Amino acid sequence: FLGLTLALSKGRILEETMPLLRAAGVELLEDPEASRKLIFPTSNPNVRVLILRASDVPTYVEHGAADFGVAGKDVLLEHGANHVYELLDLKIAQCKLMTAGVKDAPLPNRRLRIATKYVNVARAYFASQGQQVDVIKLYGSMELAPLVGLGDLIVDVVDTGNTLRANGLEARDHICDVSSRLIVNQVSYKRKFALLEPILDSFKNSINS
Amino acid sequence: FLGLTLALSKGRILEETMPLLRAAGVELLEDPEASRKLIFPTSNPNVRVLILRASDVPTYVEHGAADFGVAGKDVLLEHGANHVYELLDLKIAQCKLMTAGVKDAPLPNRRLRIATKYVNVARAYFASQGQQVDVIKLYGSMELAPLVGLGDLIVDVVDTGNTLRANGLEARDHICDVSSRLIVNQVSYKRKFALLEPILDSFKNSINS
Numbered sequence A, B: 001f002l003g004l005t006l007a008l009s010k011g012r013i014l015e016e017t018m019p020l021l022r023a024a025g026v027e028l029l030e031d032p033e034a035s036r037k038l039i040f041p042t043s044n045p046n047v048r049v050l051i052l053r054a055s056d057v058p059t060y061v062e063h064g065a066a067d068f069g070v071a072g073k074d075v076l077l078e079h080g081a082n083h084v085y086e087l088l089d090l091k092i093a094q095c096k097l098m099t100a101g102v103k104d105a106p107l108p109n110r111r112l113r114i115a116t117k118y119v120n121v122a123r124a125y126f127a128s129q130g131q132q133v134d135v136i137k138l139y140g141s142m143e144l145a146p147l148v149g150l151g152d153l154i155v156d157v158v159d160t161g162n163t164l165r166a167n168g169l170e171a172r173d174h175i176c177d178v179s180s181r182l183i184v185n186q187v188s189y190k191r192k193f194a195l196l197e198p199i200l201d202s203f204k205n206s207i208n209s
């Protein structure tokens, strides 16, 4: 395959990227959500789509198994973005990285334990607050951790806050804003610029509105 | 909560554990698959259930946020089981860890690159074969990696082989057999043995048939 391979993840990123792609002349020929398939052609024969776990988008792009991808800033901060180029903030899948814990619970006076998927972000954020924390690596359902005493706080993405509130948790700190970013393989950017450029220019134009 | 907290994961482990629990006098009062809730009571007021990602079951048990759990041997090998007790092989969710690649593709004569979730298992297995491999950490959809040239082989769990065959892959090596195991927190085993013992004895009796 000589064209461009685009890495996306299911749910919000796929849904919110599709209008950008459509305006750039690229449409999927079926719903990837209803298929076990992982490689999908598009209306443009020079563009195909991989459907990946959000965590794996940076990895496929870095290695060049995809030429470009749409990844959350949260995932990029955690993975490290040093071996891809971040070209555009697409302003989609907007949310916040936050700390949270049981509503009105006092923090213990000791080294804190942070239950999170975002281990590097947690360590970096608490380092800025003057705290060298322990982290408990989890892969999902962070909202449960404080309810069963696994760690003193969590770090997770928050949008509406409904998940926190549903579980009797409240946000303690805003860490940063998160949105999805267009990342490109550093070699693909040099070798396939002629294919990438009109798509990048389209995305840039679309996000300006 | 003074009773026992049991960690399970959705899908096969939950489905195949339920008959064992039922025979031990423990039944869920609703389908956890149809709820956003993560803590569930049971017919026994001394037992509650956490529904976790399979990757997080060992973590909750190790820290004592759950007293015991059902985890795949694959997850235990990868996580490390040094700070929990593995008490029973429950003989459920049976599968194999295997290596696989594109059908009839020759291996390149260089350091191999293994795309896998099971990074520690991959390194250990290839070490037994006299190979010091590079690993590309992925979180899902391992079957895609060889189709886009991400790594030379994958390590993943295989049951029927249908996923491999669907994607033009074939298993190369059998690494080991996998089944779900009953793990216990090392402190809970000492402090709550009176609550655990009849349940463990029930499970043991059930699996003998």
Ligand SMILES: Nc1ncnc2c1ncn2[C@@H]1O[C@H](COP(=O)(O)OP(=O)(O)OP(=O)(O)O)[C@@H](O)[C@H]1O
Pocket (backbone or CB within 6 Å): A009, A010, A011, A012, A013, A053, A054, A055, A071, A072, A073, A074, A075, A093, A094, A095, A139, A140, A157, A158, A159, A160, A178, A179, A180
């Ligand atoms: N509630 C939300 N609102 C808006 N954007 C969100 C929200 N939650 C997550 N995101 C963003 O969307 C990205 C992808 O989320 P997605 O749900 O696909 O990932 P995930 O739940 O980590 O996947 P997995 O099933 O592998 O655990 C996140 O990395 C983040 O940037």
Ligand SMILES: Nc1ncnc2c1ncn2[C@@H]1O[C@H](COP(=O)(O)OP(=O)(O)OP(=O)(O)O)[C@@H](O)[C@H]1O
Pocket (backbone or CB within 6 Å): B009, B010, B011, B012, B013, B053, B054, B055, B071, B072, B073, B074, B075, B093, B094, B095, B139, B140, B157, B158, B159, B160, B178, B179, B180
């Ligand atoms: N096809 C299979 N047949 C039987 N047992 C399996 C199969 N695939 C996985 N297992 C076993 O079941 C366990 C749990 O699998 P499950 O699908 O819940 O995890 P997962 O796909 O890693 O979860 P996640 O959604 O977090 O990626 C595995 O760790 C393994 O031991």
Ligand SMILES: O=P(O)(O)OC[C@H]1O[C@H](OP(=O)(O)OP(=O)(O)O)[C@H](O)[C@@H]1O
Pocket (backbone or CB within 6 Å): A141, A156, A157, A158, A159, A160, A161, A162, A163, A164
């Ligand atoms: O602040 P809120 O609006 O409640 O959203 C925050 C939640 O969104 C994400 O879950 P998602 O909706 O992706 O479901 P998942 O965790 O099952 O993937 C994330 O894991 C948070 O739990």
Ligand SMILES: O=P(O)(O)OC[C@H]1O[C@H](OP(=O)(O)OP(=O)(O)O)[C@H](O)[C@@H]1O
Pocket (backbone or CB within 6 Å): B141, B156, B157, B158, B159, B160, B161, B162, B163, B164
């Ligand atoms: O050899 P097979 O019978 O094809 O099974 C192997 C597959 O089973 C598991 O997937 P699962 O069914 O758990 O779905 P998931 O990967 O979407 O979780 C695993 O991730 C393999 O892909």
Ligand SMILES: [Mg+2]
Pocket (backbone or CB within 6 Å): none
């Ligand atoms: Mg999600």
Ligand SMILES: [Mg+2]
Pocket (backbone or CB within 6 Å): none
């Ligand atoms: Mg699975």
